[PDB]
């Protein structure tokens, strides 16, 4: 079970994974991915 929380530190719209994952890991999540429509960096971690 993992929960999604928008990244607090990623700048701008999310198009490619690497900078979003990096931001999320910097924030102590375990991954980050881009959403399709609002194009947000969403971090995930177990919850």
Curated annotation (Swiss-Prot):
Cystine residue pairs: 3-47, 14-34, 20-41, 24-43
UniProt subcellular location: Secreted; Vacuole
Tissues expressing this chain: Most abundant in the epidermal cell layers of the petals and sepals, within the connective cells of the anthers, and the cortical cells of the style. Not detected in the tapetum, pollen mother cells, the transmitting tissue, the vascular bundles of the anther and style or in leaves. Expressed also in ovaries, but barley detectable in roots.
Entry's family note: Belongs to the DEFL family.
Function: Plant defense peptide with antifungal activity against F.oxysporum and B.cinerea. Retards the growth of the Lepidopteran insect pests H.armigera and H.punctigera.
Protein name per UniProt: Flower-specific defensin
Source organism of the structure: Nicotiana alata
Taxon lineage: Eukaryota, Viridiplantae, Streptophyta, Embryophyta, Tracheophyta
Encoding gene per record: D1
